Amino acid sequence: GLFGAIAGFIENGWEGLIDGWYGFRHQNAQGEGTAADYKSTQSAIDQITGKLNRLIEKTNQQFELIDNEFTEVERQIGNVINWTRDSMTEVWSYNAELLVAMENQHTIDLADSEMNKLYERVKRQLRENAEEDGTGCFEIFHKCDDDCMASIRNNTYDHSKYREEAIQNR
Amino acid sequence: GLFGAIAGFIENGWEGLIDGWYGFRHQNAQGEGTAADYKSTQSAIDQITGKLNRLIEKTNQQFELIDNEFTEVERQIGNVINWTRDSMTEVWSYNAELLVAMENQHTIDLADSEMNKLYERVKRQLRENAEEDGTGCFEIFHKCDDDCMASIRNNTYDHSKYREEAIQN
Amino acid sequence: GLFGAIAGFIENGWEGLIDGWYGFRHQNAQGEGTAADYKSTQSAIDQITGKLNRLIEKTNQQFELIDNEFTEVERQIGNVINWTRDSMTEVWSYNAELLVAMENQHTIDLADSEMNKLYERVKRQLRENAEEDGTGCFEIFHKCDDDCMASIRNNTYDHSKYREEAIQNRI
Amino acid sequence: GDKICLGHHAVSNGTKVNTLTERGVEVVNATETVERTNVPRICSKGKRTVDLGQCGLLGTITGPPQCDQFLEFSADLIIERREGSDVCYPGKFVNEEALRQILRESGGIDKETMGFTYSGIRTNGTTSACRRSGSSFYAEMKWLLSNTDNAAFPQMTKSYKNTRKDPALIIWGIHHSGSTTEQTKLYGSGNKLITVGSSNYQQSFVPSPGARPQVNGQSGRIDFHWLILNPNDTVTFSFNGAFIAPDRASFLRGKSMGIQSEVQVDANCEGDCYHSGGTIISNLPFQNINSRAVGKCPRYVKQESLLLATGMKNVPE
Amino acid sequence: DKICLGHHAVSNGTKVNTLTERGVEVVNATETVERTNVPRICSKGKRTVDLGQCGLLGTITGPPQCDQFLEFSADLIIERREGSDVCYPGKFVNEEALRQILRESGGIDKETMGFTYSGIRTNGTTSACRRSGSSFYAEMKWLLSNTDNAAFPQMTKSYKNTRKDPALIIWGIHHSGSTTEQTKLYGSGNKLITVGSSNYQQSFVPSPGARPQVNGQSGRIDFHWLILNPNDTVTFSFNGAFIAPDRASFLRGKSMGIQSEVQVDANCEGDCYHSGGTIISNLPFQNINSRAVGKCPRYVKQESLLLATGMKNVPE
Amino acid sequence: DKICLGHHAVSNGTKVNTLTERGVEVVNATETVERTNVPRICSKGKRTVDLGQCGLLGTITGPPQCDQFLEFSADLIIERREGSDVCYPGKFVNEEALRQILRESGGIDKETMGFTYSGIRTNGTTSACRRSGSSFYAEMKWLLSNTDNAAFPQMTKSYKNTRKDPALIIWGIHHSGSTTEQTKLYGSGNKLITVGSSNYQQSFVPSPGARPQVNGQSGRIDFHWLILNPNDTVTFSFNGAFIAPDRASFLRGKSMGIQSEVQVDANCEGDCYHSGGTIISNLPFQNINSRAVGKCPRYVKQESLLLATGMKNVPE
């Protein structure tokens, strides 16, 4: 919820979009087309995996029995052992629930961020030839074909080719 | 200070604004009017309460005395007990100060964020009929009345109704 | 990576920019000039130092020997002492690696943020007399001199002085 | 031209908090996270409370006069006092603290007869140190004596099987007489030896008769020893004198909490975290009141205060 | 007319928790607490010794049940509930410290202490350690007077640890079932045993007298122990009631010791054990057993803690 | 015409770690774990007593090596491996707890217990504590029968702590090398020592008999101790084999005690010590010694953890 994109001004996500986290749905003369962005999908996934590899880590740290399940140890040292072990369970349990809550916050906001980095980038590409309507869409103010879309996608769309055209139309 | 809104390009807050965290102050022909936004005020408050409910939690975990305040325990086990309890106090004290510092960072930046989500949204509403001056204000380039404000507020203001008008200007 | 500025749409940084973290490189009629911003450089540095002062803190907390390096203590209490000390080493090591990873995340994203606060501010100054090209640059659509740059820098550049000029010059 | 401006609220005097990044940054509203307020009473509302008074927790097992009302109690919450005493006739418990720890969490105790009977000895040795009406003794124990002064005390064996379904607590005492003469008067002459065995226990004891200062007008001492007998196990005692026999075994009733306190009980306030000087009643995660609190407690921390921002960055003019 | 960017979504996602909200649905999430036990001891690739009817402490003194374990080698030592340390009734003083040492020993290697004896017996036995008829602890010698009632001489025996690693030394004090029996075995008069080294000094008096019969014996033997540092010397002095060690023990290396109630499995690989099996997992935490040992995920209270691996899930 | 903003960069930056990626280069980073030891004991400004050949427990009883330490003051107490507690052979029962009290004592101040004695000897000595010829522990009196074999009377001595702070009380039980020797020193028959206060109650029987010679002595002395609370009274009763305290000890204040193998240095300031020197540092963590004491950064496993102080470094 940090950046306003996901669950903000974009109304929802696309259950038909199997091959990515982020992508494009366009409407022009020829037809309607959908394809998911690689560069930013890859980007997020990579930050998630980098989180995982950090936690799915193995501690190389060995502990032995101070205790005895078969003949109980003397009762006083038994009680110190138990009290300490319970105190560590508190620390670890708190750490566990905290780490997980925090990583989750961050993972969700990592996602809001990358969406709102796709957007703000495409916006930048199109300069003055289109407009923010505000539901995660750009109304293009010039006729455009399906090879014009692809050039936005793979980041080649030239503006000062369609500038004047789209400007009187505003 | 993360997003630039609060204590950034907005110069300050309004001590007269009792009924919200975020709101609107407008100036047009008729007069000057102030009313606080509900949808985003509610939004932040809800994230703060969700923080609180997580900490004002009670541990269901019971501990007993290993220790004796009336007849001291034998000294060696007493010293181990004390050293462990002191070690736990270090861990918890560090955890406490850290948790609170971190939650605070996040609470403040939660707020910067929601302001700068009100802004960027209203901006989006108005399309091309106004301008970012940069102190958290929009100069409207068409005459507008107090029923035009309310339509921005509750999110109904139509742009292509006032488009041409506001353009030559 | 959070905000998109550093290592995002700005392609890289300037190894010639000794006197700041953030600054300006301009190209106009007269020449090409570089000078680093103070107000936002100071700002970031101050948040870094404030992190540091919090960690380079000293614990006022004293601990004594429960242990004996010269004549070993009796073995059972020795084993409990060792098991507890090892358990604390686990907790602290985890805390250490976690604190440092987290602070670093935040320090990096603190930086992305301040850049993308310089930008969005200058943008705001120039109103409609220029354009986002998208590599961290503004193409100015009016001729402008080196005393016009400085007025953007120290935040005095008036827009409605060059408005019309730069506006037809966008058609 | 006309304009609309959005903006956030602010108050004239806000509160300083701390962040990752800066110290004492003012915010609109903030809240406390460390408990500093004590309730100088033991809040026992809704709990079965036994306040042990002049009775020492360990006395509830052996039964000096001052523990007579506590031989068989029930409690969720057990309160020890500093005036509490375990003992009438001078002596000590070996491994006392482990035993206190068991008793504090016991839920109270229920007593059962060990079903011992005795032939051709005395069973009713008393002392002016346990006064009931004239000389008495520990109510749950029997002071076993030779039949007459100087007589030989027979080699005896008594055994007891825990047939109940829960573990039994078993006590006995070794008597160290004030003089060797006194020993032989009570138990006859010659070396004395007591042994106590089960399947998880094995120990033997020799009295050390001889001169101690007088405490409560006695020069002898009694040392109590104890053990847990697992369901279906058997204790066996063997002895030829100087042995203080248990008359009743103790069974733990359930679950409870035990605390040591110097303050009054209060059945009107509800609390689950206790220390010697009262109750910590609070929802906050941390507390700076007492590092030795027990029960269900906020975690103890060094700091007096840690404020949690509940508001935004507060900016005025 | 338009182009629109947007994110993916699934129809039924999973609830997680955040700093800020509870049960917020995300696209994909993953578990972080291990809940799955393997009800076996996973010993693949490890030198395992399962002690069976032999008690760990028996490996040192050597009652008949431990005959196959007097000199073992292990990476992983498994104690069983049926395990017994003792043939002739008695106990180890300070048994748990000794167990802990033995569990981590890597097994033991025995060396003769080089004691010989003049003008006493050396071969006292008992029907409680049955090998073929009466026997005794294999690593110990029951020292007896030459004939019943005879005076047992004042003896001194000493042993120097000339090896490069610390030696484990055992001996026993015999508490006869009656005073008569003591003097029969050892002659009349007060008995005293002392044991000294540079870091050790203790003395022992037997307490003869009547105990119930356990394994048809009324006497008891109590074992005591010490670690002898390289180059230090133990000295025993005694005039009876003394059970002498024949061999010292040396620790072999490094191992783990566990107590278990489940079978061994040389097919699965695991490094975290508890009485009820092996915890095999990569996750940082586990809710299976707070007493697990080895290299374990940290034990926590919670049954589950899900880590988001996806984004906010917003459906139609 | 154009203006461009941008951030700085360096040609070779440092790798750090983040929540999200490993080895991400940043402009400037700083170390967070101390790795640097100072191979000396930094004692500047602290009242230091380095115990040398005196053992901490010797300061209480007073063998010749400890003669300069009977009454010292310190903020910082340094034990050495050559330190020895004892002239005549023997041990302290519960020695470690006593060391721990002494280390934090601030040093000790001695007060006479005000015992005087009738119709016994008071001046038993031994060649094992050499001052000029035979001597004894300086704070103790070896009580002997008036003549060899004579009966030692039943005695009672008591001492009340009238000061406002707790007193440390020490006494010894002498175990003679032979029974003959016991009766020679103390007369024949059973010996018993008892020691009582309001929080203490124990009795002791010597165990005369043959030990190897250590420092040419076959007997042993065992020291025992207690804390006497203000206004409480110790009472000793005994008929021989008892080594009496002449002086009680009072703790002076507060101190730190450490065990060390390195030199003292009054030029460097340090508050965190271990056997191999001082950790001097502001950093929150340290990887030098898990056993350091004082006010120390917390010990951690890792050799290094770098804290970014710069931004993400992106170069040409």
Ligand SMILES: *[C@@H]1O[C@H](CO)[C@@H](O[C@@H]2O[C@H](CO)[C@@H](O)[C@H](O)[C@H]2NC(C)=O)[C@H](O)[C@H]1NC(C)=O
């Ligand atoms: C155990 O050892 C003793 C001591 O050497 C054995 O030696 C016997 O001792 C008697 C007199 O003490 C001597 O006449 C012989 O040298 C020994 N007898 C025999 C038959 O060899 C003793 O016999 C041994 N006991 C057992 C059961 O083997």
Ligand SMILES: *[C@@H]1O[C@H](CO)[C@@H](O)[C@H](O)[C@H]1NC(C)=O
């Ligand atoms: C300590 O807790 C364990 C379970 O973790 C329990 O089984 C054991 O009996 C307890 N020991 C004592 C001395 O209470």
Ligand SMILES: *[C@@H]1O[C@H](CO)[C@@H](O)[C@H](O)[C@H]1NC(C)=O
């Ligand atoms: C241990 O600490 C407690 C309270 O923190 C103190 O009152 C007590 O005297 C100390 N006990 C020992 C054995 O030093």
Ligand SMILES: *[C@@H]1O[C@H](CO)[C@@H](O)[C@H](O)[C@H]1NC(C)=O
């Ligand atoms: C405990 O660990 C220390 C090192 O930290 C080691 O030298 C010592 O021998 C160990 N003590 C016991 C009783 O295992």
Ligand SMILES: *[C@@H]1O[C@H](CO)[C@@H](O)[C@H](O)[C@H]1NC(C)=O
């Ligand atoms: C301030 O914070 C406290 C704690 O959350 C809350 O109960 C109170 O309602 C708040 N007051 C105001 C005026 O915001």
Ligand SMILES: *[C@@H]1O[C@H](CO)[C@@H](O)[C@H](O)[C@H]1NC(C)=O
């Ligand atoms: C105690 O019991 C003995 C032996 O049965 C009896 O003869 C004696 O009189 C009793 N003493 C008292 C005071 O009841």
Ligand SMILES: *[C@@H]1O[C@H](CO)[C@@H](O)[C@H](O)[C@H]1NC(C)=O
């Ligand atoms: C307990 O033990 C007895 C005898 O050792 C045996 O017969 C049986 O298994 C047990 N009896 C009961 C009632 O539990």
Ligand SMILES: *[C@@H]1O[C@H](CO)[C@@H](O)[C@H](O)[C@H]1NC(C)=O
């Ligand atoms: C969900 O998360 C798991 C665990 O990381 C991952 O391996 C898996 O590929 C994900 N599933 C889908 C369908 O994306």
Ligand SMILES: *[C@@H]1O[C@H](CO)[C@@H](O)[C@H](O)[C@H]1NC(C)=O
């Ligand atoms: C054993 O003892 C000698 C003489 O006391 C000592 O100097 C030496 O270090 C030791 N010898 C060996 C081989 O370690």
Ligand SMILES: *[C@@H]1O[C@H](CO)[C@@H](O)[C@H](O)[C@H]1NC(C)=O
């Ligand atoms: C020790 O004191 C006794 C008792 O008066 C005295 O007679 C004896 O000679 C003294 N011994 C020495 C060596 O001073």
Ligand SMILES: *[C@@H]1O[C@H](CO)[C@@H](O)[C@H](O)[C@H]1NC(C)=O
């Ligand atoms: C100690 O107790 C005695 C009892 O005679 C009393 O007179 C005195 O007030 C007490 N002294 C101090 C210093 O508390």
Ligand SMILES: *[C@H]1O[C@H](CO)[C@@H](O)[C@H](O)[C@H]1NC(C)=O
């Ligand atoms: C890192 O080097 C920088 C850059 O010159 C310098 O300002 C700073 O002193 C260094 N970092 C620290 C924590 O001192």
